[PDB]
Design a protein around this ligand. Structure first.
Ligand SMILES: *[C@@H]1O[C@H](CO)[C@@H](O[C@@H]2O[C@H](CO)[C@@H](O[C@@H]3O[C@H](CO)[C@@H](O)[C@H](O)[C@@H]3O)[C@H](O)[C@H]2NC(C)=O)[C@H](O)[C@H]1NC(C)=O
Ligand SMILES: *[C@@H]1O[C@H](CO[C@@H]2O[C@@H](C)[C@@H](O)[C@@H](O)[C@@H]2O)[C@@H](O[C@@H]2O[C@H](CO)[C@@H](O)[C@H](O)[C@H]2NC(C)=O)[C@H](O)[C@H]1NC(C)=O
Ligand SMILES: *[C@@H]1O[C@H](CO[C@@H]2O[C@@H](C)[C@@H](O)[C@@H](O)[C@@H]2O)[C@@H](O[C@@H]2O[C@H](CO)[C@@H](O)[C@H](O)[C@H]2NC(C)=O)[C@H](O)[C@H]1NC(C)=O
Lengths: 199, 127
């Protein structure tokens, strides 16, 4: 039915396949000297997924001249049948890793400066990003979180929306400003902190 | 959407020409291909054309068939020459999703396509 893959900007293509039982993704980069497969494993009742690890985690294995033909192959007895296929331009399908290494730089009674790191991405992409940040507060849900979206070259944010002496959690996600099918990264692991008491 | 045409009856050694009317966008932007399905056989690839105009053909029809597009007329063609009885089958055109195909060898894969034509019959009499 649907065959969707994303590239983390370095050396990791992750594919998801859902159809209405032994299947693989075959990766065939045009005019390169290697091919690679991964075994599609159940991820939901509906879909399968696996990752094509192209090299070391911070290695720039692909560029904008690369074209990776991606095939879903499944076992039809002793023959392998092509179930889905796409020519994959990697930088048209970016989805970065979730930001990591969150830490409270400085917390006060109504504000908090939180910084993070962008992993497995060239310094180029750090300068062409959009960020989204949200907070969790007592009595509310992540869906009710106030959302902040920011187009900036900056891996920190000073939240102004806080109340004193309160427990919070903070999450951030990233999206490059390029690529037709580029999507948001997953949310970072939530960072817990508490605002200071009112003086 | 996709509408085949030009499918009829010819004798062996003849030469026919299929037409597939499509949108202005698909004719200019997306991979397209011709496929055939003989009775008791699966749909096999005949010819494929990539957005850059590059082409590819199945082994059985190489040199005889020619795939082409006309952006002015919003039409895909399959010029088939020197037809043989083996070429008797239902012929289908198909258009790929935009941005999902750039090479004619991929455009030859039936698994690529979710938009197909109704098909046109092509019968060749044994000579
Ligand atoms: C919120 O916290 C972040 C993280 O600490 C602050 O960003 C940091 O700002 C300092 C101040 O300029 C930067 O330090 C500078 O480093 C350069 C390195 O060459 C040095 O030349 C300067 O003399 C200075 O020491 C630091 O690099 C920067 N860090 C990051 C990750 O951006 C931010 O300023 C804080 N925001 C507020 C409103 O306080
Ligand atoms: C990468 O793979 C392609 C394709 O290989 C075939 O298709 C895969 C999906 C899988 O089914 C494989 O087991 C198949 O072998 C290779 O392309 C072939 O290259 C040879 C040259 O050695 C050529 O004669 C064949 O016609 C090609 N096949 C097709 C379908 O075009 C390619 O060589 C592989 N690259 C590397 C570096 O191994
Ligand atoms: C390689 O990537 C997979 C998939 O991660 C997702 O897709 C990437 C392209 C990128 O967009 C990520 O931000 C996405 O999260 C990673 O596998 C996942 O790892 C997490 C953490 O262990 C796990 O919760 C998920 O279930 C995993 N998903 C699958 C399908 O395995 C993998 O860790 C990455 N490897 C490297 C070396 O970067």
């Amino acid at each position: 039915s649907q065959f969707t893959c994303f590239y983390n900007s370095r050396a990791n293509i992750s594919c998801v396949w859902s159809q209405d039982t032994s299947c693989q993704v075959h990766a065939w980069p045009d005019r390169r000297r290697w091919n690679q497969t991964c075994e599609l494993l159940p991820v939901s009742q509906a879909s399968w997924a696996c990752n094509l690890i192209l090299g070391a985690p911070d290695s720039q294995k692909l560029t904008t001249v690369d074209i990776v033909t991606l095939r879903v192959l499944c076992r039809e007895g002793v023959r392998w049948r092509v179930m889905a296929i796409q020519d994959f331009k990697p930088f048209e399908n970016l989805r970065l890793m979730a930001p990591i290494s969150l830490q409270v730089v400085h917390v006060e009674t109504h504000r908090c400066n939180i910084s993070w790191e962008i992993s497995q991405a060239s310094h180029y992409f750090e300068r062409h990003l959009e960020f989204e940040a949200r907070t969790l507060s007592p009595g509310h849900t992540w869906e009710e979180a106030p959302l902040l979206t920011l187009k900036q070259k900056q891996e920190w944010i000073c939240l102004e929306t806080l109340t004193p002496d309160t427990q919070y959690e903070f999450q951030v996600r990233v999206k490059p400003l390029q690529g037709e099918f580029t999507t948001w990264s997953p949310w970072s692991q939530p960072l817990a902190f508490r605002t200071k008491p009112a003086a | 959407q996709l509408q085949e045409s030009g499918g009829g009856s010819v004798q062996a050694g003849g030469s026919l020409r299929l037409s597939c009317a499509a949108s202005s966008y698909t004719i200019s932007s997306v991979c397209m291909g011709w496929f055939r399905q003989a009775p008791g056989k699966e749909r096999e690839g005949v010819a494929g054309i990539a957005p850059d105009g590059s082409t590819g053909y199945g082994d059985s029809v190489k040199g005889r068939f020619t795939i082409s597009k006309d952006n002015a007329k919003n039409t895909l063609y399959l010029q088939m020459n020197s037809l043989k009885p083996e070429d008797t089958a239902m012929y289908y055109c198909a258009a790929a999703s935009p941005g999902r195909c750039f090479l004619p060898r991929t455009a030859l894969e039936p698994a690529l396509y979710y938009n197909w034509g109704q098909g046109t019959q092509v019968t060749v009499s044994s000579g």
